């Protein structure tokens, strides 16, 4: 079961930001609202926006920020990379304990998809190795954020900016730096070749075992390097020794050595499913981390 | 297409914990009432075949420990309604949303806010199977977690969690304490009926495929509803009801494909198979997206 973090602490931070005829979402923390800077663009701007030039021509009053029924007055603005920081005269009393983090490819996070400052849905995503995310985002979703929650603390890792022609998604960390080679201009952009997140496939195979499904297992083993040669051939990410270590708990819990599971995955890559399924899926799933699998079996 | 849950914040604001002795589970605090599974009053020994009426007569308001976080909520009345306990408390929950209690039909989906000790752990989308089980992710201490949909301002609570079956699927009640399906809250082995495929949701999924331009499977024929239902049953698909036909109305109107024409297309897929083709990038027909889920995601 793909499980998202409860979204309430983030919902209390979502607001609507309008500049001209463009509306998207912002993240309101203490007295600052964070949003994608392309809100300040028009059509004649989209293709090669000189953002510093476009922004110097704006006044605080060109930014309409709405939290529910209430307008928040903008008293100052600045730009950090691809994010605009709007200072407002009110502090958000619902601001959670938080930090900004930049996540690594292969890590997972929850997305709170919003439209016109209103939360619409929540789901789990992974940062792909090619730094896209396979999200569900429509017009008006920009400024939706991705996050993880640990104890009382919300770690914001993603703010949404764009869709690629292939239907995957691209965005920034909360410092406004893109994940991947993408640019906030209105042009058709391709990503690099994606690969499958191998440590996550292995965690999901252990999950299938824990839950009684183990038809894909075999009596064989493999060395780490020989597995990695096969993985790379099938556009799977290499498995590191730290990945093996990270998988220890699941290996212990099931009594299946990591390199034994690697041998099973090799067999699946070479043979296929035989038209069968694992945990319901006809495809190998790679957006559960070892931590995810552990926490949901704990 | 992915399972998308509703934002959980309005339900998070309603979760509490309810303890009787050492048995702790979750409760739902709306206005000045806390709702929770009645088996909270059972010792791990009453659970074999509890006499719930006799167990409740031995309890008093002061035997129930209700906490929102570490803050005790004083209980001032208690009653049992089917398989749920209603604990009247002396504080109205200031975070009570607009809400209603609804009893859903098989095939309908809902979000579950999985909770432990009154604390939310995660949120995910579930479908009520035709055999009245859900495939949840529930561990010990999850009972009293609820399932819900949100429409406009309003939370429609439809599920409260009570138990796991031998097979690992999950069973529970509506918020009036009436179980979905033929289950009882006793620690006995109970079997669900054989499961079937949720036809109305597969049809919704075929409509979504058409909306996205994937329409190779549309054929020139049509069928009656009765003929389709009789065929569908031979493939372990649910028969359609009139309400199913109606809730496909909007997708039929969006695509211009009559419901019964889509039924004829599905019937051909059932009888002839996919012949190696995929739909929406899948050789498997998906049955856990309702017609409303398709509208939610695509708009
Ligand atoms: C913000 O809400 C918006 C979210 C998008 C809209 C649909 N789904 C989403 O996730 N963001 C955008 O529309 C950005 C704005 C830029 C200034 C960063 N652009 C896009 O997401 O465009 C997507 C289309 C593939 C792009 C494309 C562009 C230009 C073409 O012609 C030369 C062709 C295709
Ligand atoms: Cl008929």
């Amino acid at each position: 079961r793909k499980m998202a973090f409860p979204s309430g602490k983030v919902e209390g931070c979502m607001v609507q930001v309008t500049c001209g005829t463009t509306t998207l979402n912002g993240l309101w923390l203490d007295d600052v609202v964070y949003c994608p800077r392309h809100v300040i663009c028009t059509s004649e701007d989209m293709l090669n926006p000189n953002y510093e030039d476009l922004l110097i021509r704006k006044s605080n009053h060109n930014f309409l920020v709405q939290a529910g029924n209430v307008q928040l007055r903008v008293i100052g603005h600045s730009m950090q990379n691809c994010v605009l920081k709007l200072k407002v005269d009110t502090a958000n009393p619902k601001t959670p304990k938080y930090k900004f983090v930049r996540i690594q490819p292969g890590q997972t996070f929850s997305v709170l998809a919003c439209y016109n400052g209103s939360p619409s849905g929540v789901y789990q995503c992974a940062m792909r190795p090619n730094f896209t995310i396979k999200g569900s985002f429509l017009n008006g979703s920009c400024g939706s954020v991705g996050f993880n929650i640990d104890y009382d603390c919300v770690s914001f890792c993603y703010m949404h900016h764009m869709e690629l022609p292939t239907g995957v998604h691209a965005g920034t960390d909360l410092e406004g730096n893109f994940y991947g080679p993408f640019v906030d201009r209105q042009t058709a952009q391709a990503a690099g070749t994606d690969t499958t997140i191998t440590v996550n496939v292995l965690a999901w195979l252990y999950a299938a075992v824990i839950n009684g499904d183990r038809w894909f297992l075999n009596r064989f083993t493999t060395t780490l390097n020989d597995f990695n040669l096969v993985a790379m051939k099938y556009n799977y990410e290499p498995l590191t020794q730290d990945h093996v270590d990270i998988l220890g708990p699941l290996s212990a819990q099931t009594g299946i050595a990591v390199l034994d599971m690697c041998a099973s995955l090799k067999e699946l890559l070479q043979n296929g499913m035989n038209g069968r399924t694992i945990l319901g899926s006809a495809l190998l799933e790679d957006e559960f981390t070892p931590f995810d699998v552990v926490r949901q079996c704990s």
Side-chain angles (χ1 to χ4, degrees), chain A residues 1-43 45 47-65 67-68 70 72 74-93 95-96 98-149 153-218 221-273 275-290 292-294 296-298:
Chain A
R1 302 308 322 248
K2 199 163 277 178
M3 195 164 306
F5 291 105
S7 60
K9 295 180 166 56
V10 179
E11 294 172 49
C13 303
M14 299 311 301
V15 302
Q16 184 188 41
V17 182
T18 303
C19 187
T21 56
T22 297
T23 301
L24 40 65
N25 308 281
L27 186 71
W28 179 27
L29 307 169
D30 298 312
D31 62 352
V32 175
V33 174
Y34 301 76
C35 71
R37 70 180 176 173
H38 73 251
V39 66
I40 66 175
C41 294
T42 70
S43 316
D45 286 317
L47 275 179
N48 181 16
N50 192 319
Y51 279 111
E52 290 280 29
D53 213 56
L54 302 173
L55 182 59
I56 196 85
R57 301 176 191 263
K58 295 277 175 283
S59 319
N60 289 336
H61 78 258
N62 292 132
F63 297 99
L64 310 185
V65 181
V70 185
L72 313 181
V74 179
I75 61 178
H77 65 263
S78 59
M79 176 163 69
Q80 179 174 10
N81 300 311
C82 304
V83 156
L84 187 60
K85 297 188 278 200
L86 304 176
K87 180 87 74 192
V88 293
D89 62 352
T90 320
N92 188 359
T95 305
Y98 77 89
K99 51 190 197 185
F100 290 168
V101 301
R102 191 185 172 79
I103 57 163
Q104 301 288 308
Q107 296 194 257
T108 58
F109 58 98
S110 294
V111 172
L112 180 64
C114 304
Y115 300 88
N116 298 280
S118 299
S120 83
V122 61
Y123 52 89
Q124 198 79 343
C125 280
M127 180 60 60
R128 306 300 305 163
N130 72 354
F131 289 110
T132 65
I133 77 173
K134 306 169 184 285
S136 306
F137 291 116
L138 313 168
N139 283 357
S141 61
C142 287
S144 299
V145 297
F147 59 97
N148 284 275
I149 302 183
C153 190
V154 177
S155 293
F156 293 103
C157 58
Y158 179 86
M159 178 170 275
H160 184 52
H161 297 241
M162 55 194 295
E163 192 169 299
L164 308 190
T166 54
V168 301
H169 294 103
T172 67
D173 64 21
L174 270 293
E175 293 196 55
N177 288 316
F178 266 88
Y179 295 102
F182 305 110
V183 176
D184 46 344
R185 56 168 61 177
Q186 184 72 29
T187 65
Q189 302 174 45
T193 286
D194 205 15
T195 45
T196 301
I197 307 158
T198 307
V199 64
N200 289 2
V201 175
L202 292 168
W204 172 80
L205 288 177
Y206 279 111
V209 164
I210 294 176
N211 281 264
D213 210 350
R214 84 218 310 285
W215 64 267
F216 52 86
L217 295 191
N218 62 33
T221 192
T222 180
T223 71
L224 185 58
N225 187 62
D226 287 342
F227 172 76
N228 278 334
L229 287 170
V230 177
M232 286 181 297
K233 185 190 175 185
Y234 289 91
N235 273 300
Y236 272 55
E237 291 287 288
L239 197 75
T240 68
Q241 183 59 46
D242 301 335
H243 289 152
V244 174
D245 295 339
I246 291 152
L247 285 165
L250 292 172
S251 193
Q253 179 170 337
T254 62
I256 296 167
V258 178
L259 293 176
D260 287 357
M261 195 66 84
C262 284
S264 291
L265 177 53
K266 195 192 286 178
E267 171 162 55
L268 292 170
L269 295 178
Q270 294 175 334
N271 295 0
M273 245 88 165
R276 318 189 38 160
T277 72
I278 299 164
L279 285 185
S281 168
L283 296 172
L284 302 179
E285 173 68 42
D286 77 335
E287 299 206 350
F288 292 100
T289 70
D292 296 342
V293 166
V294 157
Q296 180 179 147
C297 298
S298 285

